[PDB]
Amino acid sequence: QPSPTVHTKEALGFIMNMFQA
Amino acid sequence: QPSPTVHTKEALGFIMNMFQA
Amino acid sequence: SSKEVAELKKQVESAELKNQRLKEVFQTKIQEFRKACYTLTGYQIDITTENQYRLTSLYAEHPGDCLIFKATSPSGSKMQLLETEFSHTVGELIEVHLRRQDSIPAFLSSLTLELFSRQTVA
Amino acid sequence: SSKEVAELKKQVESAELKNQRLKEVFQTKIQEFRKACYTLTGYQIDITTENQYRLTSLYAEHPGDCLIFKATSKMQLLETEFSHTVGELIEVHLRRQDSIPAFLSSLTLELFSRQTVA
Structure with a gap:
């Protein structure tokens, strides 16, 4: 739990939203 | 004959890569 | 203002647009695949x-x-x-x-x- | 100004980093999604x-x-x-x-x- 860097979280926040419908 | 703008074509080169085998 | 500042703004613009197309391209092909899996399976x-x-x-x-x-x-x-x-x-x-x-x-x-x-x- | 030049160079690197990441997490997610669709269906x-x-x-x-x-x-x-x-x-x-x-x-x-x- 290093934490993801802001560029990894932002990209994961939108990419995972596109898999939800 | 609509075309492909450069930023659009560049994203398609990585986009389709993971849709095979 | 200066040509150096300009050139850098156009690079920021260029990257923030690569963005806008990677999203929209990742947007249709993901749905293309999922709606295809839906129609087929x-x-x-x-x-x-x-x-x-x-x-x-x-x-x-x-x-x-x-x-x-x-x-x-x-x-x-x-x-x-x-x-x-x-x-x-x-x-x-x-x-x-x-x-x-x-x-x-x-x-x-x-x-x-x-x-x-x-x-x-x- | 050198001020604005320095701030913009960092913005370019930040903008490029955001795009680069969008590439990596997409790659991992669809291969996860592809493997899941294969195992399930x-x-x-x-x-x-x-x-x-x-x-x-x-x-x-x-x-x-x-x-x-x-x-x-x-x-x-x-x-x-x-x-x-x-x-x-x-x-x-x-x-x-x-x-x-x-x-x-x-x-x-x-x-x-x-x-x-x-």
């Missing part, structure tokens, strides 16, 4: 907020009816069925195909055919 | 070089057996060596029932029955 596969997989049948009786599977680990291929309100109703199919046969494809195939037969015209 | 869904969808069953009896579906709202099954071997399934489920899901489901169960041990 009869299952709408969503990724939940917990990175699990929610399946809704094309022949679902009620819109909220779904199944949820979770991957046990990234470095493995096993998957497990989690309890939903709808999975409560198909205990017999789960016993035959998931427990005795250990085949998720056989389970979802049998469930698809069963739901198809139930969706009569009248 | 039993079909390998490949978008082919003609915007066609070629499907391979987990229970395919011979390497190379595949089904190809053409896209237009409705989807047409095209001719493949394996298409001919299941003319019976195509008649019941694709034409009479007008259901690709019922077709592929019946195929999976038939292939699974012949895949079993002992």
Whole structure:
């Protein structure tokens, strides 16, 4: 739990939203 | 004959890569 | 102002636009694949907020009816069925195909055919 | 100013970093999504070089057996060596029932029955 860097979280926040419908 | 703008074509080169085998 | 500042603004603009096209290109092909999986297999596969997989049948009786599977680990291929309100109703199919046969494809195939037969015209 | 030049150079690096990341997490997620769709449904869904969808069953009896579906709202099954071997399934489920899901489901169960041990 290093934490993801802001560029990894932002990209994961939108990419995972596109898999939800 | 609509075309492909450069930023659009560049994203398609990585986009389709993971849709095979 | 200066040509150096200009040139850098155009690079910022250029990158923030690569963005806008990677999203929109990742946007259609993802849906293309999912809507194709839906049309072909009869299952709408969503990724939940917990990175699990929610399946809704094309022949679902009620819109909220779904199944949820979770991957046990990234470095493995096993998957497990989690309890939903709808999975409560198909205990017999789960016993035959998931427990005795250990085949998720056989389970979802049998469930698809069963739901198809139930969706009569009248 | 050097002030603005320095701030913009950092913005360019930040903008490029945001795009680079969008590439990496997409790659991992769809391969996770692809592996999940394969394990659950039993079909390998490949978008082919003609915007066609070629499907391979987990229970395919011979390497190379595949089904190809053409896209237009409705989807047409095209001719493949394996298409001919299941003319019976195509008649019941694709034409009479007008259901690709019922077709592929019946195929999976038939292939699974012949895949079993002992």
